[PDB]
Amino acid sequence: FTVEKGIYQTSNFRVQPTESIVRFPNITNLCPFGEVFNATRFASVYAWNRKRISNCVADYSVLYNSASFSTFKCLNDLCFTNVYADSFVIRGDEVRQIAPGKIADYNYKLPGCVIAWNSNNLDSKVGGNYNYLYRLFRPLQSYGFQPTNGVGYQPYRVVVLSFELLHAPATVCGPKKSTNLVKNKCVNFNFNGLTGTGVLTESNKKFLPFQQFGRDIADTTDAVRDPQTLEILDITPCSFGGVSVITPGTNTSNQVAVLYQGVNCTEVNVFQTRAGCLIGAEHVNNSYECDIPIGAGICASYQTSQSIIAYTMSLGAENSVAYSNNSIAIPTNFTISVTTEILPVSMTKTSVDCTMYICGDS
Amino acid sequence: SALGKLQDVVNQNAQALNTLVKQLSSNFGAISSVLNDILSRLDPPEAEVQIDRLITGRLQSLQTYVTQQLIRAAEIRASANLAATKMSECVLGQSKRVDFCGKGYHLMSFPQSAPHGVVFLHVTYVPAQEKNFTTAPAICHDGKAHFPREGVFVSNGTHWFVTQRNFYEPQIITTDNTFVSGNCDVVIGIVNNTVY
Amino acid sequence: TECSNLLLQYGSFCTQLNRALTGIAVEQDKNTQEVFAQVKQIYKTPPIKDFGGFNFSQILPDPSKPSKRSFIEDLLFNKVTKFNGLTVLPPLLTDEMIAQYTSALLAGTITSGWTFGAGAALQIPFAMQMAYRFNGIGVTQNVLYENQKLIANQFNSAIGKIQDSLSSTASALGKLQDVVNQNAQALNTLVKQLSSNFGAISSVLNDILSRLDPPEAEVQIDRLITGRLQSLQTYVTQQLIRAAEIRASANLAATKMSECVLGQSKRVDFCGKGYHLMSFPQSAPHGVVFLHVTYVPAQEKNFTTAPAICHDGKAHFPREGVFVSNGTHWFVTQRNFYEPQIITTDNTFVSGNCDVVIGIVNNTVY
Amino acid sequence: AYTNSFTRGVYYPDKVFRSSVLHSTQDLFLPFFSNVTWFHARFDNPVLPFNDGVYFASTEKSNIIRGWIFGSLLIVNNATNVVIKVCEFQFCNDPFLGVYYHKNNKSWMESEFRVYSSANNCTFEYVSQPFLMDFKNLREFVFKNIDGYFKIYSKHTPINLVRDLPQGFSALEPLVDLPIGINITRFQTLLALSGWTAGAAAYYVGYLQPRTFLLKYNENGTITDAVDCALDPLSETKCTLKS
Ligand SMILES: *[C@@H]1O[C@H](CO)[C@@H](O[C@@H]2O[C@H](CO)[C@@H](O[C@@H]3O[C@H](CO)[C@@H](O)[C@H](O)[C@@H]3O)[C@H](O)[C@H]2NC(C)=O)[C@H](O)[C@H]1NC(C)=O
Ligand SMILES: *[C@@H]1O[C@H](CO)[C@@H](O[C@@H]2O[C@H](CO)[C@@H](O[C@@H]3O[C@H](CO)[C@@H](O)[C@H](O)[C@@H]3O)[C@H](O)[C@H]2NC(C)=O)[C@H](O)[C@H]1NC(C)=O
Ligand SMILES: *[C@@H]1O[C@H](CO)[C@@H](O[C@@H]2O[C@H](CO)[C@@H](O[C@@H]3O[C@H](CO)[C@@H](O)[C@H](O)[C@@H]3O)[C@H](O)[C@H]2NC(C)=O)[C@H](O)[C@H]1NC(C)=O
Ligand SMILES: *[C@@H]1O[C@H](CO)[C@@H](O[C@@H]2O[C@H](CO)[C@@H](O[C@@H]3O[C@H](CO)[C@@H](O)[C@H](O)[C@@H]3O)[C@H](O)[C@H]2NC(C)=O)[C@H](O)[C@H]1NC(C)=O
Ligand SMILES: *[C@@H]1O[C@H](CO)[C@@H](O[C@@H]2O[C@H](CO)[C@@H](O)[C@H](O)[C@H]2NC(C)=O)[C@H](O)[C@H]1NC(C)=O
Ligand SMILES: *[C@@H]1O[C@H](CO)[C@@H](O[C@@H]2O[C@H](CO)[C@@H](O)[C@H](O)[C@H]2NC(C)=O)[C@H](O)[C@H]1NC(C)=O
Ligand SMILES: *[C@@H]1O[C@H](CO)[C@@H](O)[C@H](O)[C@H]1NC(C)=O
Ligand SMILES: *[C@@H]1O[C@H](CO)[C@@H](O)[C@H](O)[C@H]1NC(C)=O
Ligand SMILES: *[C@@H]1O[C@H](CO)[C@@H](O)[C@H](O)[C@H]1NC(C)=O
Ligand SMILES: *[C@@H]1O[C@H](CO)[C@@H](O)[C@H](O)[C@H]1NC(C)=O
Ligand SMILES: *[C@@H]1O[C@H](CO)[C@@H](O)[C@H](O)[C@H]1NC(C)=O
């Protein structure tokens, strides 16, 4: 409850990230799933064409959150080797047959997700549609249609997306959200999985046409190239440092100053020093013997009304000896001075045994 | 605050012991930091996985304490060696070494025992009340240069004397205070005068 | 935050580590202060540089440059060449302040000799000061005044050679460079240790948390904590070991400043090789440099010597010196410089008879 | 036959730009001064094991070396442009790419592709930009298949030799990286080509080995020199001291 005069390291300052920057490369090469579900023409159930795709950005969220479907019997956070996206039309109650039925045993056999949509809008020909061919048994005779049909007899354009988890690397990765880029502000940066904290700025380094990252001798990442745009950005460490409190001692006063080691006073009587930022101490042009060492030649003291002052400590009086080639100074008196020197000699002899300390009669 | 060094040693040791004891209240990932609680709650098969976490925790903390003591004992020994040396050549004799026995020209030292340490009272001679004089390396008397055998030539302004080095006790320059070496032609700063 | 809760189970291992490091940091300021804050006042050399022929221009501060740093100090500084919670604190005494202390110590020695280290600074001509130094190594003071021009030239040439040695070769400051390298790699090793699994699935906590549920992610995190905690322990222990080593070196530099710079040392080989005369401190990065001015005898020649001589049935011994012979005549000379002179009754003392001394000779005393 | 791979087979292991440092990489490299196998384009297009990746040099004029078969897989650097296709190709026992040697065109124009006969199970396909049809340059290639991720490196560097690898230094900038995810246990070389005189093109095979290899990145992030950890004691001490 009482602290003696001095400098004390209380806590640790660290600029909390105003934002967590995440910069996935611009979402391009959109997967052709946009046109699979409403292609100009679809094949028969038995003639289901495989639209296997690789290295495409399949946006399942827009498809899943479309409000223009019939059954989503299953996504953008998962990447897969390929998507065996089928394409066909089934008659009403056959939708339930597409699940892990006439269609389920003759035309299709599901061992992914299933998407269905009202086919009466486009595929249903007016006056009788027979373009599709139906395998009644497993045998292709006809399908049959009527525009004035109900729901169980109504066709449904169904595309069956079957995700693959083969040993081959996943290639159909869904879109990943990205933040914006803000410079000159501590923010957590994650462009392509390289998450970290640092102030983001424009750098002078030139990257190789292929290189994306940059690292220091200690293997730490220092500069990055934005995947969305070819800008070389230097990632400096996010501002942080210790917080130490100058106190002249409770026995003297309760006023204190706070030092933020290694900061510019912009991230926090505010005085900028080579040792950090001083708050609560007023800079004085005078120089005295060091009382409390702030650092970098700066010391803080309590003096007269009273306050804490920060000053550049003085090394002593600026004496100049009256030297000349033919003058000598010779003492005419003397003084007998008895000074003190204190040296530690020994410590306390402490003995400790494990079994008592570690376990204890156990 | 004079005995800061002695108090610092006591404070450092007591602080180290306190942290060692405070470490006994840590869990180290175990269900409890009390060994009895683990024993009285769990069967041996599941108590070992918990007691083992404590053992590594207590053991590591104890090892950290011992190594810190070894390093701390090394500097205390270095201080004791220095204190032993000072007693040998600062209390038991007069030392020419500068600042080894306080600021000034060492005269004598006295030891005083202190808790876990020693205190030396260094008696030193510090000159005071200096005065400015004009001085010469030597004096030419009869074509021969005279040098102070143990002294320095100083001038009141009109007369030349020979004081000792560091206490103004002027003396008449005689052939007993000075020795001759060569003629007064090679020393820079020679000043004419008479040698009684 | 998931880890920070886990790390609390280890108690106060980290209040200990910070206490150990802050204890080291406070010591480093004490080391520098003890070595350099050896002068009560900031003595200044006079504008007139009539030092009997010695020019200390290469060791005195040069106000032309911003740092007001000596010429040789500049050579020393050139020769010697905030990532993961790791901060380097600035020393309490700036390089400019250190260079001011050496200037004060240097200025005091030139103008005062050893007096300023034992009280008030008492001026004395440098040539007369060197006479004290010669007298302090057993050589009479007339040899300095007679050879003042030669001795001054020898000092200037010797100081000139130190410039070439430092400027031409960058390997002279190995001791100071080694300290910098050791600290630099200690931090690099500590930082590089963050890239090791220590047995966990990965060295990145985000991956561990992302790819595992808290139960099985907690065990993986604990492996990282123990390894990273252990690596932080070895760093502090090494620093404590090194800090003790540097403190011993700093304690030695402090003693050398007191005994070599603030006075004349009779201790052999302490302040350079030979007979100590003077020492001049210079400031170097994270260290100090001493220029030990030493008196080395040279060009010896053989002589025939005797312990004493018989004059009138009584043995004469030299008051201070040696008995030497030309092969036909006998003289008495000082030991460290051949300055023969007539053997008289003023430079010898009589004690006893002629038949107790082995090697007695039969010369005459005038 | 065999020759010496003096200081070739060095590329950029990763997508990292580092300035004025010396980086040590335990990677799949070509040992210095190694007895690299020597074939001649007499025509030599045998099947060789694709064990732990493989290097490939080509003193290529008129685009002699036009493809390679791994796995079914191909990297057909045809005349038009690079074409990497992943399918269950029914590769011929003697696969190659046919070229009409100035058959009245006063130019070696590619007109045939006997690399494979048909494709059944296609998984991937990539097509790159075109390039000049041209020897005075040492085109070199490296091929790796790790964790399914299939990597390709190459560089276009001028040289002034005829049939031996020059004693210079060059770094193969990566050009392609694909997740074909197939099993590659063997490979073969497809070259320019009933009745032929294969164009003079010294093409080499160097079975890369996992080895530490110290790289010197200049201030521009482009590799300027390198050494090994097993070439000789001198190299070993350099790598230990990172200098
Ligand atoms: C050398 O210095 C010493 C002191 O360090 C001088 O002795 C001091 O002399 C003064 C004046 O003579 C004394 O002051 C007087 O003290 C008496 C009491 O005895 C008082 O009644 C007077 O009114 C006056 O204040 C002083 O006490 C004395 N100090 C000591 C310790 O004895 C000495 O004179 C100096 N020598 C020379 C040659 O200058
Ligand atoms: C520096 O000190 C010397 C000391 O010798 C001074 O010279 C001599 O000083 C003494 C003491 O004052 C003189 O004695 C005089 O005696 C007469 C007769 O008894 C008396 O009336 C005077 O008051 C004085 O006491 C002496 O004559 C004088 N000269 C010699 C050759 O001894 C010298 O003057 C001093 N100089 C300065 C600048 O202080
Ligand atoms: C004590 O030593 C210092 C140097 O060790 C002397 O100062 C140097 O004196 C020399 C000769 O006078 C100077 O050389 C001249 O330099 C100028 C400028 O470069 C050049 O134009 C002239 O042709 C000539 O070479 C030198 O500059 C000067 N300073 C330094 C740093 O070397 C000093 O004079 C000595 N003390 C004495 C002689 O009392
Ligand atoms: C060792 O030292 C003694 C004494 O210094 C040497 O004896 C001296 O020898 C020199 C010439 O060798 C003599 O010089 C002569 O002096 C007379 C004056 O009396 C002068 O008229 C002559 O023209 C000549 O210059 C000197 O007198 C003589 N000293 C004595 C006392 O006899 C001795 O030669 C030295 N031995 C060596 C160097 O081996
Ligand atoms: C010390 O005295 C000597 C002589 O006693 C001085 O030297 C003489 O000076 C005069 C006039 O300056 C000359 O005429 C003589 O030739 C010099 N030599 C001799 C042997 O007399 C000398 O100058 C005096 N020193 C001082 C500092 O006054
Ligand atoms: C030094 O001189 C003394 C006397 O001048 C020598 O002593 C004499 O020695 C001779 C023969 O050795 C004797 O006959 C005398 O009786 C001695 N006299 C005395 C008074 O002792 C001595 O021998 C000489 N020493 C040397 C080395 O020549
Ligand atoms: C596209 O698909 C939607 C289903 O979400 C369908 O309603 C529409 O008719 C299709 N074609 C066009 C041009 O929108
Ligand atoms: C930040 O601190 C550095 C270090 O002194 C300084 O050079 C820079 O100008 C400061 N920037 C701001 C905005 O205060
Ligand atoms: C001492 O200095 C003054 C002025 O600089 C000069 O006149 C005098 O000759 C010098 N003395 C000696 C002995 O050189
Ligand atoms: C002294 O004499 C010895 C042998 O006579 C010789 O080796 C030595 O060099 C001589 N000393 C000197 C200084 O000449
Ligand atoms: C010194 O030793 C030599 C050795 O030959 C001997 O001849 C001589 O007599 C000795 N003299 C004395 C005084 O011991």
UniProtKB/Swiss-Prot annotation, chain D:
Source superkingdom: Viruses
Outcome of substituting R139S: In strain: Gamma/P.1
Region Disordered, annotated ranges: 98-120
Domain BetaCoV S1-NTD, residue spans: 1-241
Region (Putative superantigen) location: 218-239
Function text: Attaches the virion to the cell membrane by interacting with host receptor, initiating the infection. The major receptor is host ACE2. When S2/S2' has been cleaved, binding to the receptor triggers direct fusion at the cell membrane. When S2/S2' has not been cleaved, binding to the receptor results in internalization of the virus by endocytosis using host TFRC and GRM2 and leading to fusion of the virion membrane with the host endosomal membrane. Alternatively, may use NRP1/NRP2 and integrin as entry receptors.
Protein name: Spike protein S1
Residue span relative to the full protein: 27 to 305 of 1273
